[PDB]
PDB file of C-alpha atoms in Angstrom:
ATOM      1  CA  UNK A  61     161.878   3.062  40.778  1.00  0.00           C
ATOM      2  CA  UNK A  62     161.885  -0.911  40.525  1.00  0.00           C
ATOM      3  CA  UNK A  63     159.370  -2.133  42.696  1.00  0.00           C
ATOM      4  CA  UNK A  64     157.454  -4.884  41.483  1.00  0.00           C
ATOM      5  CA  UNK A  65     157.752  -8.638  41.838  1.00  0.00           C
ATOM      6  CA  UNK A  66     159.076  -9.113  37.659  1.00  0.00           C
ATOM      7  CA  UNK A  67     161.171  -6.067  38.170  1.00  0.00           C
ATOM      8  CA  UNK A  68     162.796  -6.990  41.311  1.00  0.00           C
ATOM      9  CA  UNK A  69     163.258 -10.519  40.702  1.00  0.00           C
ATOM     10  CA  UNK A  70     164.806 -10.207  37.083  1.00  0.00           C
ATOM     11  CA  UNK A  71     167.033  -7.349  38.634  1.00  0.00           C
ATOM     12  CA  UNK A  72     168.571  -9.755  41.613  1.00  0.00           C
ATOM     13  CA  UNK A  73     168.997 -12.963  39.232  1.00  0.00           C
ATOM     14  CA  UNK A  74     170.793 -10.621  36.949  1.00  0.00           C
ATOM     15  CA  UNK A  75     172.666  -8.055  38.519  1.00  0.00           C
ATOM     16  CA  UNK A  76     172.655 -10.285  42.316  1.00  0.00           C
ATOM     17  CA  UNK A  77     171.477  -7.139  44.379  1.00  0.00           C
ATOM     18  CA  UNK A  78     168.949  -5.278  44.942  1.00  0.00           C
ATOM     19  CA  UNK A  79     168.164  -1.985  43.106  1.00  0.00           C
ATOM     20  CA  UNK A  80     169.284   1.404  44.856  1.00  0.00           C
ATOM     21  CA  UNK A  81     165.691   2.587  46.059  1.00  0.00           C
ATOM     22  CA  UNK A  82     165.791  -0.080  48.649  1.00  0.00           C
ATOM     23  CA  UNK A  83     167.752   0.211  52.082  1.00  0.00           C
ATOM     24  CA  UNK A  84     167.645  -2.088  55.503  1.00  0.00           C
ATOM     25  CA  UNK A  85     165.364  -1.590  58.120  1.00  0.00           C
ATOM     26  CA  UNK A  86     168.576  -0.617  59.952  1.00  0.00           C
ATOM     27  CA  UNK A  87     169.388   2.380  57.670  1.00  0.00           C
ATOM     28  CA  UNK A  88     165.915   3.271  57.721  1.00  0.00           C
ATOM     29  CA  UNK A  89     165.613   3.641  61.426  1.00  0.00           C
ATOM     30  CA  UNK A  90     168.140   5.416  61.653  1.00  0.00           C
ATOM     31  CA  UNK A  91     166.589   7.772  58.878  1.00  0.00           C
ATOM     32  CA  UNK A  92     164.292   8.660  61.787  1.00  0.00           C
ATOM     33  CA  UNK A  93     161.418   5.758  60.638  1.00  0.00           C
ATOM     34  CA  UNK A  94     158.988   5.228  63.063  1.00  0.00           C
ATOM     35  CA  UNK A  95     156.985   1.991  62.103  1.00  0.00           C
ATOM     36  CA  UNK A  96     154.134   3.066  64.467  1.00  0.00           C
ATOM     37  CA  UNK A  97     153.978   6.236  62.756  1.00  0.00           C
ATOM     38  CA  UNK A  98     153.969   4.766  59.114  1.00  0.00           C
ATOM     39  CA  UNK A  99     156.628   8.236  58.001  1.00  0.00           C
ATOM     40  CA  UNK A 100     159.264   6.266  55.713  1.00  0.00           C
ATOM     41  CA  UNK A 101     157.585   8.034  52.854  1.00  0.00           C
ATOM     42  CA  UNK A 102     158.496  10.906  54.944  1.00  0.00           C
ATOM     43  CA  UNK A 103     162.067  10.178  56.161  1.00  0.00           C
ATOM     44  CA  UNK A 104     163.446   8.325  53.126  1.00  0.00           C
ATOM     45  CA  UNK A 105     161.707   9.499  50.361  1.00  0.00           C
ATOM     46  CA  UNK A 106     161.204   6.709  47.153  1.00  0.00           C
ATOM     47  CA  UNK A 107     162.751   3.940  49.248  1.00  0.00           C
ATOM     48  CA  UNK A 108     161.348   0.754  50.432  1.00  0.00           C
ATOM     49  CA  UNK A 109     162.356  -1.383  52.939  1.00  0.00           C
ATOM     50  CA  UNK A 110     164.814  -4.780  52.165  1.00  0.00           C
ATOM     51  CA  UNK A 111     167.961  -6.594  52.065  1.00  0.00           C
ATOM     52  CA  UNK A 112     167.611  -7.937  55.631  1.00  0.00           C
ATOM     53  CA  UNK A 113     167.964 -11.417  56.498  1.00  0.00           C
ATOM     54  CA  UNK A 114     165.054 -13.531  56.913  1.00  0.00           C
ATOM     55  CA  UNK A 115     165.047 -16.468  59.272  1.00  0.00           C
ATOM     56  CA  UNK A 116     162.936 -18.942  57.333  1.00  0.00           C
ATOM     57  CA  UNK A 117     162.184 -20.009  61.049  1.00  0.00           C
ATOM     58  CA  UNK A 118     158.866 -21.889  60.158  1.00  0.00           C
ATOM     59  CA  UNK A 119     160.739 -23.676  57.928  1.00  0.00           C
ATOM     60  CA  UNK A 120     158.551 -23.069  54.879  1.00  0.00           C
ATOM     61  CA  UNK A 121     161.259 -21.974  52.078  1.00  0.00           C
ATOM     62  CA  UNK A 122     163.216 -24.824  50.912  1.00  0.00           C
ATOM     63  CA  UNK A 123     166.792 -25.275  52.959  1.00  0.00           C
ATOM     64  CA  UNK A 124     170.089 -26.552  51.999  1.00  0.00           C
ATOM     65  CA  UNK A 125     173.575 -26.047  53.179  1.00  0.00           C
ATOM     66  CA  UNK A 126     175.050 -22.675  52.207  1.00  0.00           C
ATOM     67  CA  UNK A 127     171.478 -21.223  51.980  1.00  0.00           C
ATOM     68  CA  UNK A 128     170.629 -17.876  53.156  1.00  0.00           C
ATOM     69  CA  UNK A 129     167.597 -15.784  52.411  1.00  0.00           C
ATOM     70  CA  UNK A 130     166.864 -12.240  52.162  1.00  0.00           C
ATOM     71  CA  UNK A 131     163.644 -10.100  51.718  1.00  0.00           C
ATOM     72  CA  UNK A 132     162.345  -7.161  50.199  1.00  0.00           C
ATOM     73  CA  UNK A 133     159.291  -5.107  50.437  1.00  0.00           C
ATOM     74  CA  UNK A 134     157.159  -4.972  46.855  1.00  0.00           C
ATOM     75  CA  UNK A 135     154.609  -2.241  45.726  1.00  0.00           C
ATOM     76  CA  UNK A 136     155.507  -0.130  48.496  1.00  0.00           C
ATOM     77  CA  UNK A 137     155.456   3.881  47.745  1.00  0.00           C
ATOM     78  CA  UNK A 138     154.302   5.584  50.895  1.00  0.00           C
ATOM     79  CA  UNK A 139     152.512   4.938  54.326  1.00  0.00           C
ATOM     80  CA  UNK A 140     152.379   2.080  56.273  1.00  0.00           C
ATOM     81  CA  UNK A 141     154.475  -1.359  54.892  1.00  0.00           C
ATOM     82  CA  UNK A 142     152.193  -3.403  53.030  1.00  0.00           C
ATOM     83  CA  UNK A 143     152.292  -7.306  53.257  1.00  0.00           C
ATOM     84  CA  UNK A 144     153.994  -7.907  49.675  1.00  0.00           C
ATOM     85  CA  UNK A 145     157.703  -9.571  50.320  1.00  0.00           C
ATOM     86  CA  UNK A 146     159.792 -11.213  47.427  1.00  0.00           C
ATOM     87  CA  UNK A 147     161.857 -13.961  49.041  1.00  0.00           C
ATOM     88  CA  UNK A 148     165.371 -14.540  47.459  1.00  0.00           C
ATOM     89  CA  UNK A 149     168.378 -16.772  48.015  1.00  0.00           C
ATOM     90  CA  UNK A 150     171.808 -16.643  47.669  1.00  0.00           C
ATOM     91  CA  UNK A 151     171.929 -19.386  45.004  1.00  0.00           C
ATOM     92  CA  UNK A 152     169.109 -16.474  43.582  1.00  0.00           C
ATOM     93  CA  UNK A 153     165.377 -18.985  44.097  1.00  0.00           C
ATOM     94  CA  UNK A 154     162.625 -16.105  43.785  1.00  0.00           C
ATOM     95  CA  UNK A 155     159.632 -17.045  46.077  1.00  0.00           C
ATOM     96  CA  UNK A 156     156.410 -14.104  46.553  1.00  0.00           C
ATOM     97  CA  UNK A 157     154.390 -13.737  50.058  1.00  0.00           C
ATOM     98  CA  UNK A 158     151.362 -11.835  49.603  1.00  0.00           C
ATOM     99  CA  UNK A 159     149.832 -12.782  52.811  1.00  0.00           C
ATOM    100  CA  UNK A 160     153.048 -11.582  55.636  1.00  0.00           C
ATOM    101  CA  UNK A 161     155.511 -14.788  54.909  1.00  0.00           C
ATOM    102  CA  UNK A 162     152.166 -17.481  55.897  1.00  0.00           C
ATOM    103  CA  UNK A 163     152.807 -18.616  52.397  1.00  0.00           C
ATOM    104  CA  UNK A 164     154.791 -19.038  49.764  1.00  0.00           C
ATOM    105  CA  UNK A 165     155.127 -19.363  46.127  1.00  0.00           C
ATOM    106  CA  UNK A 166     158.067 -19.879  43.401  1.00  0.00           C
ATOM    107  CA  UNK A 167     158.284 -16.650  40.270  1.00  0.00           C
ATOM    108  CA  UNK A 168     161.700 -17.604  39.504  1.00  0.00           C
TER     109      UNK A 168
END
């Protein structure tokens, strides 16, 4: 599975999706997750969480007109979700959270 911030992000700048082992929290909820129960291991076995919008409500990812990001979870493999996200755009910026989306920095 690609899972890792260099994997992932030189897989969406090329190919401009995702790889298949990811789904939306959507999908995976109706999987039968349960966040409080930590089971996506469980219910969708070798996924991970992302595609799903992402607000950028704070304001902290750089905005333009056109500009819509997306998220995805990174080194995730089983138990609860961890708080690794790699943040992407659609003119494909590649920006890592390590700390649930308080801050930001640019890998591609």
């Amino acid at each position: 599975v690609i899972n890792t911030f260099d994997g992932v992000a030189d897989y969406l700048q090329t190919y401009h999706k995702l790889p298949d082992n990811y789904i939306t929290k959507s999908e995976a909820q109706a999987l039968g997750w349960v966040a409080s129960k930590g089971n996506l291991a469980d219910v969708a076995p070798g996924k991970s969480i992302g595609g799903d919008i992402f607000s950028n409500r704070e304001g902290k990812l750089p905005g333009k007109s056109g500009r819509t990001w997306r998220e995805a979870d990174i080194n995730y493999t089983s138990g609860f979700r961890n708080s690794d996200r790699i943040l992407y755009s659609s003119d494909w910026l590649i920006y890592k959270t390590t700390d649930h989306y308080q801050t930001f920095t640019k890998i591609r």
